[PDB]
């Protein structure tokens, strides 16, 4: 029910035609209601002679004058003169908020470069009350105004966490191998819901999502940050990528790790980016959160560590690629447990050398054919290398010898379900795998589905 001048005229006509006779009054009101250059009265008896529709004519002229030149409205919206014309059109169409404003809202959305917050607050309130169709401009205004866009992003973050939990529960026959291109889902719609060339709102939303995933969230969060960074890099989001100084570089490094998982040049680039980094408060804590929250990145780093251990066992030079992998594991182990400056306490050289010698001895035994103390030390030691050791063991006589070690490590030590599923999918040994699985709700369901 659009008011304004038209609504006032309708109210006046209703007040005038409120009984009291006046048959000529109704005719005067009908004649006064015919737009300009009164040849419409000349066209009237041409249409009156066969059951006169006036509603058909009015709806037809409204529909053509809207739809045919909404393209012209967009063309004049597509700099200073066009922006001023769009502002004037928005000021004219603001009075028709209760009126149907599909075209009136599209005219303001097309020239939405000037925010105009004095009417923008009322427009945002009306859009929140009436669920307006302004998608991009409405989302940008909601992100820049208050935490309504923050609440919308928190709901999508919870939905993404629930989807990740359901995917972890729904087991299948390699930790869901998918790069940034094929994983376009559940974040491409959220990325399009972002402001686009809105560095401040997108950065605030990313910071809120990272804080929610770190302080009161699992490790499932903070991979959506890498997903949205990859989507913006592939989407040609120049401003958002250029806002983060090292964020684009570490996102490219993460994409290269996800694409291949074995590259010395990528490791050198990551080491060079970490060497000349800023302080741990800004660009260091965020980089640590991006390293820790990446589950697919963590799996790629574990595969790279296994490959580097195999290469070191082949070369027989235990004691820089292994050091780079250890530094990456220490950086991406966890940083959201305690909020503080950027620190990298890691690289146990003696324990790392003891763990690598066990894998080297297992490989040498497997090569020659075609233990418990090392497993106890791994269970009573750093589990970051334990995950890599379990992944290496999961994927003739050497395998039979390492099966008791895998059973001992299974009885020693959340993330082990994915490693066990990968080992079962990659792999006489079936009975040993079933005995290891039965020696321990997602893990039991995965064991039942495997057998």
């Amino acid at each position: 029910x659009x008011x304004x001048x038209x609504x006032x005229x309708x109210x006046x006509x209703x007040x005038x035609x409120x009984x009291x006779x006046x048959x000529x009054x109704x005719x005067x009101x009908x004649x006064x209601x015919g737009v300009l250059l009164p040849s419409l009265q000349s066209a009237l008896p041409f249409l009156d002679l066969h059951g006169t529709p006036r509603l058909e004519f009015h709806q037809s002229v409204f529909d053509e004058l809207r739809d045919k030149l909404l393209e012209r409205v967009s063309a004049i919206a597509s700099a200073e003169e066009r922006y001023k014309k769009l502002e004037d059109l928005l000021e004219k169409s603001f009075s028709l908020v209760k009126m149907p404003s599909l075209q009136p809202v599209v005219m303001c959305v097309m020239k939405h470069l000037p925010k105009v917050p004095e009417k923008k607050l009322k427009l945002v309130m009306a859009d929140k009350e009436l669920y307006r169709a302004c998608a991009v401009e409405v989302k940008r205004q909601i992100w820049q105004d208050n935490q309504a866009l923050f609440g919308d992003e928190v709901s999508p973050l919870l939905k993404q966490y629930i989807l990740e939990k359901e995917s972890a529960l729904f087991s299948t026959e390699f930790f869901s191998p998918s790069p940034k291109t094929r994983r376009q889902g559940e974040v491409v719609q959220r990325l399009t819901r972002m402001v686009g060339k809105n560095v401040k709102l997108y950065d605030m939303v990313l910071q809120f999502l990272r804080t929610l995933f770190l302080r009161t969230r699992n490790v499932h969060y903070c991979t959506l940050r890498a997903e949205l960074l990859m989507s913006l890099h592939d989407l040609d989001v120049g401003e958002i990528c250029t806002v983060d100084p090292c964020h684009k570089f570490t996102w490219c490094l993460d994409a290269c790790i996800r694409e291949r998982f074995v590259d010395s040049k990528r490791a050198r680039e990551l080491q060079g980016f970490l060497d000349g980094v800023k302080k741990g408060q800004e660009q260091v804590l965020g980089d640590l959160s991006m390293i820790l929250c990446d589950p697919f990145a963590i799996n790629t780093l574990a595969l790279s560590t296994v490959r580097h251990l195999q290469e070191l066992v082949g070369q027989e030079t235990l004691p820089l690629l292994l050091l780079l992998r250890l530094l990456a594991l220490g950086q991406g182990a966890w940083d959201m447990i305690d909020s503080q400056v950027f620190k990298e306490p890691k690289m146990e050289v003696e324990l790392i050398t003891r763990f690598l010698p066990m894998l080297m001895s297992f490989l040498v035994d497997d090569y020659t054919f075609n233990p418990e103390s090392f497993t106890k030390f791994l269970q009573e030691q750093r589990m970051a290398c334990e995950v890599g050791l379990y992944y290496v063991l999961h994927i003739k006589n050497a395998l039979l010898r390492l099966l008791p070690g895998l059973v001992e490590t299974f009885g020693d030590l959340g993330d082990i379900f994915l490693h066990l599923l990968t080992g079962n999918l990659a792999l006489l040994e079936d009975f040993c795998s079933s005995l290891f699985d039965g020696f321990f709700r997602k893990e039991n369901v995965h064991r039942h589905a495997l057998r």
């Binding site: 709901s155 919870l158 939905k159 629930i162 359901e166």
Partner: protein, 536 residues
């Protein structure tokens, strides 16, 4: 439009005189004409199909079937002769085959895709018989056993010869030779005690034991009152009381047209899987089990749901006795869920607000978990993924045949492009191929049987002179003595008179044996006659 199939006993025991002086077959024919008069009193019987099956051989058993008009039905009902044996089981099998041969070619049964009460062809079989023993030219039987020797293609899918929408009623004639004085004959008609009674009761019908012409008229009025459009549903008591006779009943629900409209099927007794090559045989009456525990009727706005009024029965009397229209009794079929053998409630039994009738409301398969969920989305929401993971949890338990009706219901509700609109796998390719081949063979015997009801069965007899291949001819009914064309047809007793009549016929110098019904043709004779002039 209903089908009235009359299974007239044409066994020779029907030639028994009553106190009326007429045989039982005469009483049977007159019962049929009085039934048709009382049916024609109802002005909703403007479209009504009458069929006639006798006890004769299957070439001659079906006297009027599909595509037989009223005149042929009457002319063959009048000309019945009770010269056969009491082959009740074979005649019942032929009657059910004549009712069910079109079912697979037109797909009323909807096999494997849910039991649709609106997919019905409402027919009742009124068998008029006596209490004599059943005979099969080797002895008496003393128990009714329908033979399964030459099955119609697809008969194994239902495991019983009768169907969902077919009810067998027996009008057992027990008129004595001498009139019996009785003042208690104005009371209710007793159930008969012959072998036809359990077979009538298992199809949702009943047997009438008449003993007088007024009892016969009372039974005919009751039979006219029982010509309805509905399907027979077996109701069972699932839990304890909230054995009494309301525990089990093969009652009738009513399917009122506007063609009937409906959305939800009664669920099958199995869980459909594409691994099984053969569709499981389902009972002709779906065994539903009502929950005696009180629940709450759950209806949301714009919801496609179907309400079926139960016919009066001990179950409806029990429900209306516990006067509580605000509550409902949830109903479900067993072994319909993928895991639970008990099943999920597909509907509830709610008494009317006026305490008049008991209505069966059929719903989606698990309505207490879908209606709050779907009502929640259409009250709050643009689906959310927290809702959609719950909706997928419902779709994991829903049988596959509900997916089509659910898609149509949410399409007409206001959410066209919902998840229910995405794909429809249905049955196994072996089952679809089997059903299509069964439809083709059903067409084959459909055009076989319909072509063989009339002008395809002519009987000629012989004496078959024994040796201690020659035969002696009989006086044929259709002798047609061509006495003017054949000299051998002229008897010696009137040889001279017929000779001079032939001589008068050939030179320049039978008729008036019109078969009675056409000898008084008022309209036909004047139509061929020229019209006169008109008055001043």
């Amino acid at each position: 439009m209903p089908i009235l199939l009359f299974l007239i006993d044409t066994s020779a025991s029907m030639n028994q005189r009553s106190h009326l002086g007429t045989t039982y077959l005469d009483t049977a024919k007159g019962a049929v004409e009085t039934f048709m008069k009382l049916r024609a009193r109802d002005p909703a019987s403007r479209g009504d199909r009458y069929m006639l099956v006798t006890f004769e051989e299957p070439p001659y058993a079906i006297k009027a079937g599909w595509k037989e008009n009223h005149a042929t039905f009457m002319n063959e009902l009048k000309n019945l002769q009770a010269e056969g044996l009491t082959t009740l089981g074979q005649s019942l099998r032929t009657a059910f085959d004549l009712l069910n041969l079109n079912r697979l070619v037109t797909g009323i049964d909807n096999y494997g895709q849910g039991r649709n009460p609106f997919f019905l062809e409402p027919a009742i079989i009124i068998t008029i018989t006596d209490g004599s023993k059943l005979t099969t030219t080797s002895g008496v039987q003393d128990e009714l056993h329908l033979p399964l020797n030459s099955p119609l293609p697809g008969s194994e899918l239902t495991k019983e010869p009768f169907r969902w929408d077919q009810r067998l009623f027996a009008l057992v004639l027990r008129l004595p030779g001498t009139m019996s004085v009785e003042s208690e004959q104005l009371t209710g008609v007793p159930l008969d005690d012959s072998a036809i009674t359990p077979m009538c009761e298992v199809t949702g019908g009943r047997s009438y034991s008449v003993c007088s012409p007024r009892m016969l008229n009372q039974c005919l009025e009751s039979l006219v009152q029982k010509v309805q459009s509905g399907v027979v549903i077996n109701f069972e008591k699932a839990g304890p009381d909230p054995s009494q006779p309301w525990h089990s009943c093969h009652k009738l629900i009513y399917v009122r047209p506007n063609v009937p409209i409906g959305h939800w099927p009664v669920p099958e007794s199995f869980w459909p899987d594409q691994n099984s090559p053969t569709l499981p045989p389902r009972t002709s009456h779906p065994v539903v089990k009502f929950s005696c525990t009180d629940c709450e009727p759950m209806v949301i706005d714009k919801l496609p749901f179907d309400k079926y009024e139960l016919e009066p029965s001990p179950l409806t009397q029990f429900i209306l006795e516990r006067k509580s229209p605000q509550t409902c009794w949830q109903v479900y079929v067993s072994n319909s869920a993928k895991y639970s053998e008990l099943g999920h409630p597909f509907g509830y039994l709610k008494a009317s607000t006026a305490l008049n009738c008991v209505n069966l409301f059929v719903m989606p398969y698990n309505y207490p978990v879908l209606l709050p969920l779907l009502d929640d989305l259409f009250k709050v929401h643009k689906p959310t993924l927290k809702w959609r993971q719950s909706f997928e949890s419902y779709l994991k338990t829903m049988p596959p045949y509900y997916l089509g009706p659910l898609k149509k219901a949410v399409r007409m509700m206001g959410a066209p492009n919902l998840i229910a609109d995405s794909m429809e796998y249905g049955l196994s390719y072996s089952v679809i191929s089997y059903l299509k081949k069964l439809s083709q063979q059903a067409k084959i015997e459909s055009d076989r049987v319909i072509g063989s009801v009339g002008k395809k069965v002519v009987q000629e007899t012989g004496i078959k002179v024994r040796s201690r291949g020659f035969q002696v001819a009989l006086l044929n009914k259709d002798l047609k003595p061509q006495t003017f064309r054949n000299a051998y047809d002229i008897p010696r007793r009137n040889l001279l008179d017929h000779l001079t009549r032939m001589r008068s016929n050939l030179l320049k110098s039978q008729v008036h044996s019109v078969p009675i019904a056409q000898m008084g043709n008022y309209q036909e004779y004047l139509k061929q006659v020229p019209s006169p002039l008109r008055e001043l």
